Design an enzyme around this catalytic site. Structure first.
Site, PDB file in Angstrom:
ATOM      1  N   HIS A 136       5.737   5.568  -1.466  1.00  0.00           N
ATOM      2  CA  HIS A 136       5.510   5.904  -0.054  1.00  0.00           C
ATOM      3  C   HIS A 136       5.386   7.419   0.108  1.00  0.00           C
ATOM      4  O   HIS A 136       4.272   7.928   0.284  1.00  0.00           O
ATOM      5  CB  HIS A 136       6.643   5.360   0.805  1.00  0.00           C
ATOM      6  CG  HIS A 136       6.378   5.471   2.266  1.00  0.00           C
ATOM      7  ND1 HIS A 136       7.343   5.174   3.206  1.00  0.00           N
ATOM      8  CD2 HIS A 136       5.258   5.798   2.957  1.00  0.00           C
ATOM      9  CE1 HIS A 136       6.834   5.347   4.416  1.00  0.00           C
ATOM     10  NE2 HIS A 136       5.577   5.737   4.298  1.00  0.00           N
ATOM     11  N   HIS A 167       2.017  10.229   1.918  1.00  0.00           N
ATOM     12  CA  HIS A 167       2.293  11.439   2.707  1.00  0.00           C
ATOM     13  C   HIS A 167       2.026  12.724   1.947  1.00  0.00           C
ATOM     14  O   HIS A 167       1.217  13.552   2.387  1.00  0.00           O
ATOM     15  CB  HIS A 167       3.776  11.413   3.125  1.00  0.00           C
ATOM     16  CG  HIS A 167       4.065  10.372   4.153  1.00  0.00           C
ATOM     17  ND1 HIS A 167       4.036  10.671   5.493  1.00  0.00           N
ATOM     18  CD2 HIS A 167       4.301   9.037   4.058  1.00  0.00           C
ATOM     19  CE1 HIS A 167       4.309   9.569   6.191  1.00  0.00           C
ATOM     20  NE2 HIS A 167       4.454   8.559   5.345  1.00  0.00           N
ATOM     21  N   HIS A 170      -1.244   3.155   2.346  1.00  0.00           N
ATOM     22  CA  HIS A 170      -0.073   3.557   3.133  1.00  0.00           C
ATOM     23  C   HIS A 170       0.397   2.371   3.990  1.00  0.00           C
ATOM     24  O   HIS A 170       1.599   2.132   4.100  1.00  0.00           O
ATOM     25  CB  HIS A 170      -0.390   4.752   4.047  1.00  0.00           C
ATOM     26  CG  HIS A 170       0.743   5.087   4.951  1.00  0.00           C
ATOM     27  ND1 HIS A 170       0.753   4.764   6.292  1.00  0.00           N
ATOM     28  CD2 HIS A 170       1.928   5.693   4.689  1.00  0.00           C
ATOM     29  CE1 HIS A 170       1.918   5.160   6.819  1.00  0.00           C
ATOM     30  NE2 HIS A 170       2.636   5.733   5.867  1.00  0.00           N
ATOM     31  N   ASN A 200       4.157   0.923   3.985  1.00  0.00           N
ATOM     32  CA  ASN A 200       4.916   1.446   5.104  1.00  0.00           C
ATOM     33  C   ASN A 200       5.348   0.355   6.078  1.00  0.00           C
ATOM     34  O   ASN A 200       6.493   0.359   6.486  1.00  0.00           O
ATOM     35  CB  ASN A 200       4.048   2.459   5.867  1.00  0.00           C
ATOM     36  CG  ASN A 200       4.778   3.098   7.070  1.00  0.00           C
ATOM     37  OD1 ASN A 200       5.400   4.136   6.912  1.00  0.00           O
ATOM     38  ND2 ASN A 200       4.652   2.507   8.263  1.00  0.00           N
ATOM     39  N   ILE A 219       2.642   7.659  10.377  1.00  0.00           N
ATOM     40  CA  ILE A 219       4.071   7.500  10.585  1.00  0.00           C
ATOM     41  C   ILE A 219       4.763   7.367   9.234  1.00  0.00           C
ATOM     42  O   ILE A 219       6.014   7.525   9.151  1.00  0.00           O
ATOM     43  CB  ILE A 219       4.338   6.254  11.496  1.00  0.00           C
ATOM     44  CG1 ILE A 219       5.797   6.218  11.976  1.00  0.00           C
ATOM     45  CG2 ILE A 219       3.890   4.962  10.804  1.00  0.00           C
ATOM     46  CD1 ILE A 219       6.245   7.565  12.625  1.00  0.00           C
TER      47      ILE A 219
HETATM   48 FE   LIG Z   1       4.702   6.421   6.156  1.00  0.00          FE
END
Ligand SMILES: [Fe+3]
Length: 817
Positions: free
Chosen positions: A477, A482, A668, A672, A817
């Protein structure tokens, strides 16, 4: 006069925008001055409020404006704007009628005095650099120069300066030496992707560490405003660390709630009757945006978490070996399992440091449904979840911490004839070296349904899932989505003009990524932040992700390459996607290949609209500077590696854009949005373990016999960090109602090119088609074992669409997010 319409959003009446408040000057794309720069018209002010257009909504207002513009001044291709008001506003668009010229702006415009140079906006035409109309060439390059800034100075809220820096802003050595952290990036010891430069300057005590700040800058338009406060999900992380976590802590310090869970029902209570907390603790939560959406409350003493999807049908199914294995292919972290083609499994670690690394798992002990080991190996039915080499280098230092103890685990899985996975052995490994003071030994644990052996096996699964949760959060993750993506965001704004086709192709897939990352550096992955205080490795967590990044390979992020590298598929040109899965019903991979294919088709259709030949890619100066910088600066610690695409061909451009879009959107989403649905029951996804297995003849051993639930709960994450972890994963699993999903864009007029618009419509239609197909898969009774499992939770994480909320589906364009 040219009739124009300005649409803007006040920061928050409309008459204050009139008079001499806001001026625009149109800029010619076809008539140039004596320096060949497009002629600029007179300052023209907003003249009145437009009330006619019904198609407006969402806090927007429209303003009428008439520009003096003789056909002499040619055709407008850009405009300057100056805001003479004290307060900034959000500029949506300018439209010039009668054929129509559209400018999509979507940018905050601060008071004119705050800008070194006047804000400039371009019409919605798309140009590679050699196609830029001559009178705009200089304006185009000057705006890029503006965006790059000069590499110095403290960045301010209104700045729009994109640049790189290392992760030297996580430690807080001015507060305590205990909060000092290694700089991640820029050394061989700790390679790491770069992040957005903030320039706050050095701490007093360490010139290599950046000082603390109340706000971690991002370039202004990266900081997404929201019409609804509940949609500002990224700010929840900050409120949780800064306000809510201390409130929870005080309830425990004052002994107002029991310190530990005592039975599994104490955990289930969290989403049933709720937990009772002091009034002032409830009163701290209730008025906070975002946080107040996380819990139901009586407004007095109760907080109740939402029921996680994984327990919605069966509260005990998480404990089954079927679900433990199923989640390695359809769970929160479905991308680590590997084929095992020899037995016993091997280690590349140095036995001189860690002791003999030979596996202790014997083939004859395993239940492979009647298959011999040779048969299982040869039929490609043996797999593993291998954390041995990953964790072993860190086990000694982790286990030296108070209240952390881990093993480096390996789990062997067998693919049954019915197409489901079953776990057949777990190896719980510890390093050994001559001076060791601990007498704890490595162990192999085999499945068991009854007696103390069943409890030891349940604990063994917990140690595995602590390894997996740590690897998921830090690597699958954080690192791979990110952190890996941010350098590409920065390079794109530094080197590809808003006019550039590849800018238009990629930027939707960056929405909110720099923003969430900066908030993460401040509150999630900072020294003593949420991750360090809730996950096993504590202060070693972020540096572990640096060690893993040593082996990050951009081209292995492509889904087919990943599947082949992990030995879960083989190349097969006779199949639609070019690979044959070795686990036929592997939901993440089977659904993923469909999304991957749709993205690939879209990229292959868009690119040729702008690049006819390999030469056209080599000769695009913005594109070449972009890619050079992304690799040599953004991911500069890996610039020595041979696998980077060179970007001299159409194929290379498609490959690079396809991998970037894949990481940002589907990859993602898959890692996520399952966080709370699977991990909202801490027993299913423990984030930490606090003791090793007990020795026979000890009270801890007798507890395993007499009170297995307590044995389990004393082993996994404590109650206080559980309440914090659950709250943060609840936030991160939620879709804001203003999200922009794959197949959507925030504006229908992002380009004036009809062929690009058509191709994008085809892409969105294909995704709708794919969702129908995924629905049929989930409804197929033959696929139930892997797509639903005993938890009866249909795998919907790669459905392209979703409504707002904690939906367990929906693929956003970006890491938002
Ligand atoms: Fe995330």
């Amino acid at each position: 006069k040219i009739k124009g319409t300005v649409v803007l959003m006040p920061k928050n009446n409309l008459n204050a925008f009139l008079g001499r408040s806001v001026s625009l000057q149109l800029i010619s794309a076809t008539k140039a001055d004596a320096h060949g720069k497009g002629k600029v018209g007179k300052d023209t002010f907003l003249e009145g409020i437009n009330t006619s257009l019904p198609t407006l909504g969402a806090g927007e207002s429209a303003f009428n404006i008439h520009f003096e513009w003789d056909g002499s001044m040619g055709i407008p291709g850009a405009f300057y704007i100056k805001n003479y008001m004290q307060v900034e506003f959000f500029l949506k668009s300018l439209t010039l009628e009668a054929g129509t010229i559209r400018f999509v702006c979507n940018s905050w415009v601060y008071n004119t005095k705050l800008y070194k140079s006047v804000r400039i906006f371009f019409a919605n035409h798309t140009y590679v650099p050699s196609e830029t109309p001559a009178p705009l060439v200089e304006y185009r390059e000057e705006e890029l120069k503006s965006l790059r800034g000069n590499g110095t100075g403290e960045r301010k809220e209104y700045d729009r300066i994109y640049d790189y820096d290392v992760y030297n802003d996580l430690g807080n050595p001015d507060k305590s030496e205990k909060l000092a952290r290694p700089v991640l990036g820029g050394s061989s010891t700790f390679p790491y992707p770069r992040r957005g430069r903030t320039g706050r300057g050095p701490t007093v005590t360490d010139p290599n560490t950046e000082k603390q700040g109340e706000v971690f800058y991002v370039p202004r338009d990266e900081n997404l405003g929201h019409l609804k406060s509940k949609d500002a999900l990224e700010i929840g992380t900050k409120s949780l660390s800064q306000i809510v976590q201390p409130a929870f802590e005080s309830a425990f310090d004052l002994k107002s709630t029991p310190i530990e869970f005592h039975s599994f029902q104490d955990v289930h209570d969290l989403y049933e009757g709720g937990i009772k907390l002091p009034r002032d603790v409830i009163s701290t939560i209730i008025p906070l945006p975002v946080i107040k959406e996380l819990y139901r409350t009586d407004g007095q003493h109760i907080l109740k978490f939402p029921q996680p999807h994984v327990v919605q049908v069966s509260q005990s199914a998480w404990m089954t070996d079927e679900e433990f294995a199923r989640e390695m292919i359809a769970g929160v972290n479905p991308c680590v399992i590997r084929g095992l083609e020899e037995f016993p499994p091997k280690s590349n670690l140095d036995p001189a440091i860690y002791g003999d690394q030979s596996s202790k798992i014997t083939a004859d002990s395993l239940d492979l449904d009647g298959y011999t080991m040779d048969e299982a190996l040869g039929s490609r039915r043996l797999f593993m979840l291998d954390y041995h080499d990953i964790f072993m280098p860190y086990v000694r230092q982790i286990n030296q911490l108070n209240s952390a103890k881990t093993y480096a685990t390996r789990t062997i899985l067998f693919l049954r004839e019915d197409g489901t996975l079953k776990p057949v052995a777990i190896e719980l490994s510890l390093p050994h070296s001559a001076g060791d003071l601990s007498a704890a030994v490595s162990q192999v644990v085999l499945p068991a349904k009854e007696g103390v052996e069943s409890t030891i096996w349940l604990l063994a699964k917990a140690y595995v899932i602590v390894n997996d949760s740590c690897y998921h959060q830090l690597m699958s993750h954080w690192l791979n989505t990110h952190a890996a993506m941010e350098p590409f965001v920065i390079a794109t704004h530094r080197h590809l003009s808003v006019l550039h086709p590849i800018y238009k192709l990629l930027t939707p897939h960056y929405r909110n990524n720099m923003n969430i990352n900066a908030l993460a550096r401040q509150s999630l992955i900072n020294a003593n932040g949420i991750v360090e205080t809730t996950f096993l490795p504590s202060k070693y967590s972020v540096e572990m992700s640096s060690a893993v990044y040593k082996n990050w390979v951009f081209t292995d992020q492509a889904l087919p390459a990943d599947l082949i590298k992990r030995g879960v598929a083989i190349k097969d040109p006779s199949t639609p996607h070019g690979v044959r899965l070795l686990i036929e019903d592997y939901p993440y991979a089977a659904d993923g290949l469909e999304i991957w294919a749709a993205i690939k088709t879209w990229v292959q259709e868009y690119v040729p609209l702008y690049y006819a030949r390999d030469d056209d890619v080599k000769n695009d100066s913005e594109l070449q500077h972009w890619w050079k910088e992304a690799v040599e600066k953004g991911h500069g610690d890996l610039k020595d590696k041979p696998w980077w695409p060179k970007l001299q061909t159409l194929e290379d451009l498609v490959e690079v854009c396809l991998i970037i879009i894949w990481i940002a959107s589907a990859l993602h989403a898959a890692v996520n949005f399952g966080q709370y649905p699977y991990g909202g029951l801490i027993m299913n996804r423990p984030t930490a373990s606090r003791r090793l297995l007990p020795e026979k003849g000890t009270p801890e051993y007798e507890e395993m016999i007499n009170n297995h639930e307590k044995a389990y709960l004393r082993t996994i994450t404590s109650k206080l960090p559980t309440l914090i972890s659950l709250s943060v994963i609840e936030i991160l699993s939620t879709h804001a109602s203003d999200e922009v999903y794959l197949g959507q864009r925030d504006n229908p007029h992002w380009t004036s090119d009809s062929k690009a618009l058509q191709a994008f419509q085809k892409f969105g239609n294909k995704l709708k088609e794919i969702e129908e197909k995924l629905v049929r898969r989930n409804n197929d009774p033959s696929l139930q074992g892997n797509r639903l499992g005993p938890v009866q939770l249909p795998y919907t994480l790669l459905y392209p669409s979703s409504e707002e909320g904690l939906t367990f589906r929906g693929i956003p364009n970006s890491i938002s997010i």
